[PDB]
Structures are given as C-alpha cells and as structure tokens.
Nucleic acid binder design. Structure first.
Lengths: 118, 62, 67, 248, 225
RNA sequence: GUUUUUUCACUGACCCGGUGAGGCGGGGGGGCGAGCCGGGCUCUCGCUUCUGGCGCCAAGCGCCCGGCCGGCCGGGCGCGAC
C-alpha cells in the first residue's frame, strides 16, 4: 500500500443495522386520518349546488392535513365513483374546501342525490 | 455562429445540432482561433523535432 | 506492594526521574483537547486512594484548566 | 465619556473593508518543487482591475505538475505585462520583467515587486501601484540579502524568498489631482468608511481630546506619548520632530 | 513477428515537461493528530536526555535468550478460567465420594516477594505505560540480590498469564527437572543486569540529534579540516 | 571539580508562514569541466525560454498464472518512477 495522496482521510469502516431486542413503541399508531375522517361534510351552498349542477363536481369540507391524492382515493372509496381532478383552498374560517371535479362518466347531480343532499 | 442565442436552461429542449457547429471545437471555439491553433499545434511540434535533430548533431562532434 | 514505591517516587517530583515524566507527559497533554477521556489512570496509585476501583463503569477524564 | 472615532474603527461593522467587487486575493504562486529547483511556465490570461486597489492584477494560468487540472493565479501585475505573455516562476527562470524568481538568484540593483518578507508567505512587500524594491547586496554565507523597500529602509531578507521582476503597474496615479470631493467619495466607496474626515477641533470635548472651547483650537500639545491609551492617543503619534520639514 | 505499430512511448518526468507519476508520499502525508503525536513522542525519548532510571528499560534481553526464558515460563504459566472449573470439580468428587509451582503476575505480588526473597528470577516489561509502576524494580531486585531481566512486549509477557498485558513476571518455585534450565537463565542474566548495574546508573539515554541535523554536523567537520 | 557568567549555535518545547502537508536530508549510479598515466579521486549538473497548441487514467520491457486443440481465444506481479 503506497500513499498517492498527501491527505489522510478516515477509512470506510463497517456499520451494522438496527437489530433491536424490543420495538420501542409496542404497536403501530393507526391512521387516525381515515377515508371517513378526511371528508367532514359536503357544502349545500347555493354557490356549491351551482358547481354540482353546472360544472359536474362535488364541493366537500376536507381535513386540513389532506393532499389532493388523499381526497381522490377517499372520494373513490366512500362514494364508489372516480374523480377527474381535485382543487383545494383553505377558507378564511380555517377549514379546507375541496372542489372535487368528477370524471364525466358520472352525473354529479345523480350522486349528490346518492350522498343525500336536497 | 450556428448556435441558438437562448436563455441557458432552455438548452435541454434544443436538439444537439442547435447547440454546436459540425467541426473540431464546435459551439465552443470560433473557426478563426481553431485553424490558427491547428497551425500553432503543428509549427511548435515541428520546432521540437528541429532542436531534437540538432541536439545529437551538437553532441556528436565531442 | 508496588503502590508505596510509586507513592514515595511521586513525592520526589524535583528528581531527574519525575522531572522527565512530568515534562514529557505535560507536552503530550497540551497536544490533546482541553477535555478528552484518558484510557486509564495516569497514576494507578493515587486513583486507588480517592476511590477508583478498576472495574467496569469507572471512568477517568484528563481535562486541563487555563492557569 | 464618548469613544473616539478611531476606537470605533477597530471595533469593525461600519469600518470593515468593502471587498464585494474586490476580485480575489492578489497572492503570488505557492512554493513547490518547480519553484525551488527549476521553473514552471504560465500565460497571462487577462490583466484585470481590482476595486480598492490602484494597481491592476493578472489572471496567470499555470498547468499543474501533479494532476491534469490547470491552476490560475492573481499577480500584482508588473508594468509592461500583456495578455498571452509567458510568465516563468522558479530558481532557473530568466531575469526579464514580470517573471518571478528568488532574490538569491538575481544581481544587485535588481528592481522587483510583490516581494516576500519571509520564504513561503506568497508575496507581501512592494506591491502597491508604481512601487519597486532594489536588491542592494547578497550574503551567500547565512543566505541573506539587503533589499531597499519603497519607503527607503533596507531590510535583511532571507534570499530563499521570491519577487516578480519589474515595477508594479498603474504607476504614478497620485500625480493627477482629485479635483472634486466626488472623485474622493467614489475612491473610498471601493475601500472602507474613512473619507469624510471631521477634524477633532470641530468635534465636542466628549468625543475627542482636541474638541470644545469657544475658539476652534487644540489647546494641549498635538504631539502625544507612544505609551498613551486608546481614546487619548490622537494627533502626532510619538513625533520625533514635527513642523515644516527642513533638510532631507 | 514484431508488430511495428507497437511504439516505445517513454514519458519525460522532468520539471515542467510531463505530469509527475503517482509515486510514494508515505513520508509527506498530513497524518492525524494522534499518528503525528505518537511519532514525535518517540523523537523526545531520542532528543531529550532520558534518565538512567527510565533509560535502563531500553537494555532488553535479546532474541537468543528471550525464547529460552518464554519457553521455560511456558512450563509454569498460571492456568485459565476453563481449566480452573475442571480442578474445582475434582475437590467436589472427593467431597461427595497440592498446587504446582506457577508464575507471579503484576508489580504488587512480585515486589512483596523480592524483599521477602521468594523471587528466584523476575522478568520486567520494557514498555509499561505509566513507567513508575516498575522504575524502582531494577534497583529493588539489585539490593535484594534477585536476578531481574527486561523483555520486549508487555503483551507477549502478558500472554504467559492468560490476560491482555502483564507488567512483571517472577519465578518463585520450579520443578527439579527444569531447575537446571532456570539456573542457566540466571547464569547469563545476572552477568548482564545485576553485576554491571553501577554502569546502568551512569547510562543516560537520548541526546542524539536529528539524522538531517547530525548530517549538518558531519558536513561542517568535513569542511574545516 | 562545583557554581556564576559572557559570546558564538543547537532544537526539542513555544511561535510563525505555506500546502490538497507532492519530491526534505544523506547516499548511490548516469552528464560536465579540471588533474597523473584501461583504471581513480575533491567538486558541477539533472532534462521544459523564439509562437495566447497539446498533455491525467503508461507505452515499453521483464515476470508469473487458469481451457478448447509445442500453436492460438485472457489475468497478475517488478522496473519504467533508485
């Protein structure tokens, strides 16, 4: 072994992985942001019933820690439907509103009746 | 010459031929300074041989 | 026992024997950081007195204080 | 009670140098094998302006002897250096201008600049615009050389240390009058906060030891003790003689 | 047969001609602060005037006699933890249904039986880190007429005992068969430590300047005559 | 002898400067002039200066080592780079 470099550099020493005698916490903490707790309620607002019957969407109030991905997979699983895109704003009230644009192979007015709004 | 004058992060989109000229030092060096360095590379490398051959024929008489 | 011989040798600090060791180690101690762990007692003898029983869990740090 | 401006100067903050557009450390090349036994060739890429410095610098590019990389140096440009000139640096390099070699390997009366005060410190002395150091005399035993500095004080220097041959460029700039306060503002804006120099007699007696009084006078001798404390040490600091300079 | 494209292409590694080859720089590495320390510690033992109390440890029992002693000590090693249980088993078999001669380990057991004069031969280690453990012992064995030798390796001396290192090893008793070989160690050692100890007290160590500083002295003395 | 002291210089703490701590000190062998008659000593050198190219990851030479069928299809180590 010959010193090409006039520098001494720390050698790549071996490191093992965590092989722990016990798990720190006993069980994994369950997903408390479910498909149910991630969609609070739909808006039955005049502005929102327009959005249901004109633009073919549904207007939900969503938990503030939800992605556009987490809403789509919630709305798909809760209402047996599919979503074209999701658009999220957080209100001045502090709650998050989701403009859930449905895929055009579903009537939003016929599924607004299914969720049970009138 | 022969290279698109465009903002430098756009260059990913441009085809290879939009970013160089088809030559030695294409899109990097100008044609003028290449062909003066084809001369400078040559006439120096020749001048090496001129003193190389004189080196032994300046030695050999001693 | 050897400890009584180390005890009374450590009282002759003006001797050629100890003036070499108290100087050459004092050099070695400057080159180290102001607080680092010593692998053992520098004095096995003196540490006996002050309660250092050489078993696992007993630690000795060589720290320097600016004079 | 107030601290004098000079003391606030050392503190830093508003009297720190303006080194934003200052272009690199104007060093020499580092002593290696090809500084100390023979020489290494380098081209002047571009002579360049360093803000806050009167003398121009030179981006000098030396090919690396150990790695395939290429090194770049900023020299206090010798007057008459041009772009695409070959600058040589080592023990065996020739005695022409803008060409560094050790002070041991050049004759007496040799004009040098960017001179090293110690071997290896990479160029400290005689490196302001239009300044030169003369190699006075050599001492092959003890390996030392007397060198007249730009001030005109011969220093005994260790002959293993290097200086580029020739006077520094930008020579004779203090000939031109700074005609207006605007030219002075712009000069010191490239350097540090030192310019609008309020005289101590104009100041109040709490800020400066010369201040106060109904008339604008010094009152105490302007020449002061070298041993004086900071805040007091003001005026003519340890003046051997003073007043209008008669004789040499 | 020689394929004429194969040209000999030699590189000119002169100053400012070709790149330098990746040669050996083992003696130009900026070492870690511990590797740097332990080397220029070893220089201070060779620069600074080492006192004869500390220097005497450099005077070590040579290869030809070290192997003679270690093989003689190999007979009389104190046993291991594994063999201890196997004998203590035998005390219990007699319970339900004398010690051999051994070595003495450590400065505290040995030094007690040098004044007591049970030590027939003591073996000092040369590189005991807090040296003061043993500094007195070369003189302590001298005044009590005990044959002492110095070995290289406190670990290899500590491998006679079943431990990592051991400072001192003393012979108290030996079998009548290996009694002869024990005396022939003492016959060589006592002539080379105990009997020339008045010279060991005079022998200061170090005070030898650098090989490129002794080269300076050996070039000025060549000049003036 | 012991001690004090003065000047010369020593390095090894301590300080400084540079570096990516890249060739330090001694010795040896190849150039060069000087000196008795092929041999030898006290020395000197170590390759690049007409140009605003180019160079790294080795050629060369030795040396060992694994099949099909002394012959072809691939590896290592030493100098070159004391």
């Amino acid at each position: 072994k010959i010193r090409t470099s006039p520098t001494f550099r720390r050698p790549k020493t071996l490191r093992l992985r965590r092989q722990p005698k016990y798990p720190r916490k006993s069980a994994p903490r369950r997903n408390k942001l479910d498909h149910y707790a991630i969609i609070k309620f739909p808006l039955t607002t005049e502005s929102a019933m327009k959005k249901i019957e004109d633009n073919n969407t549904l207007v939900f109030i969503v938990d503030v820690k939800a992605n556009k991905h987490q809403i789509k997979q919630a709305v798909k699983k809760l209402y047996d439907i599919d979503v074209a895109k999701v658009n999220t704003l957080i209100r001045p009230d502090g709650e998050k509103k989701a403009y859930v644009r449905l895929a055009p192979d579903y009537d939003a007015l016929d599924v607004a009746n299914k969720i049970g709004i009138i | 010459r022969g290279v698109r004058a465009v903002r430098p992060k756009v260059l990913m989109r441009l085809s290879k031929t939009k970013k160089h000229v088809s030559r030695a030092y294409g899109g990097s060096m100008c044609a003028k300074c290449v062909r003066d360095r084809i001369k400078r590379a040559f006439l120096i490398e020749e001048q090496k041989i001129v003193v190389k051959v004189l080196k032994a024929q300046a030695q050999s008489q001693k | 026992g050897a400890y009584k011989y180390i005890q009374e040798l450590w009282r002759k600090k003006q001797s050629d024997v100890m003036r070499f060791l108290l100087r050459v180690r004092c050099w070695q101690y400057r080159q180290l950081s102001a607080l680092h762990r010593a692998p053992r007692p520098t004095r096995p003898d003196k540490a006996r007195r002050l309660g250092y029983k050489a078993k696992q869990g007993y630690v000795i740090y060589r720290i320097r204080v600016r004079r | 009670g107030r601290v004098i401006r000079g003391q606030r100067k050392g503190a830093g903050s508003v009297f720190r140098a303006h080194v934003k557009h200052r272009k690199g450390a104007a060093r020499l090349r580092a002593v290696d094998f090809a500084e100390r036994h023979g020489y290494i060739k380098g081209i002047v890429k571009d002579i360049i302006h360093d803000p806050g410095r009167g003398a121009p610098l030179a981006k000098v590019v030396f090919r690396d002897p150990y790695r395939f990389k290429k090194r770049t140096e900023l020299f206090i440009a010798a007057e008459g250096i041009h772009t695409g000139q070959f600058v040589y640096c080592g023990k065996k390099a020739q005695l022409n201008i803008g060409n560094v070699l050790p002070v041991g390997t050049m004759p007496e009366g040799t004009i040098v600049c960017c001179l090293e005060e110690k071997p290896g410190d990479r160029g400290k002395l005689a490196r302001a615009s239009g300044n030169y150091a003369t190699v006075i005399s050599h001492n092959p035993e003890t390996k030392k050389t007397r060198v007249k500095l730009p001030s005109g004080s011969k220093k005994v220097i260790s002959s293993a240390n290097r200086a580029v041959v020739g006077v520094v460029a930008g020579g004779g700039r203090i000939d031109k009058p700074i005609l207006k306060a605007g030219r002075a503002y712009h000069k010191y804006k490239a350097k540090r906060n030192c310019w609008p120099r309020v005289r101590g007699v104009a100041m109040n007696p709490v800020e400066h030891p010369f201040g106060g009084g109904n008339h604008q006078h010094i009152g105490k001798p302007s020449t002061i003790r070298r041993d004086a404390p900071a805040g007091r040490k003001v005026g003519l600091i340890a003046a051997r003689r003073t007043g209008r300079l008669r004789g040499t | 047969v020689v394929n004429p494209l194969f040209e000999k292409r030699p590189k000119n590694f002169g100053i400012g001609q070709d790149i330098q080859p990746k040669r050996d720089l083992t003696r130009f590495v900026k070492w870690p602060r511990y590797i740097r320390l332990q080397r220029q510690r070893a220089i201070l033992y060779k620069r600074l005037k080492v006192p004869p109390a500390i220097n005497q440890f450099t005077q070590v029992l040579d290869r030809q006699t070290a192997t003679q002693l270690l093989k003689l000590a190999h007979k009389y090693r104190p046993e291991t933890k594994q063999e201890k249980k196997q004998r203590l088993l035998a005390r219990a078999e007699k319970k339900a249904a004398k010690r051999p001669p051994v070595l003495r380990a450590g400065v505290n057991t040995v030094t007690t039986l040098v004044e007591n004069k049970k030590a027939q031969l003591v073996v000092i280690a040369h590189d005991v880190d807090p040296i003061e453990l043993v500094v007195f012992l070369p003189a302590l064995c001298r005044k009590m007429g005990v044959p002492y030798c110095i070995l290289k390796g406190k670990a290899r001396l500590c491998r006679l005992v079943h431990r990592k290192t051991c400072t001192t090893v003393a012979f108290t008793q030996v079998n009548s068969e290996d009694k002869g070989a024990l005396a022939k160690l003492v016959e060589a050692i006592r002539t080379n430590y105990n009997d020339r100890y008045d010279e060991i007290r005079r022998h200061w160590g170090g005070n030898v300047l650098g090989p490129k500083s002794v080269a300076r002295i050996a070039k000025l003395e060549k000049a003036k005559a």
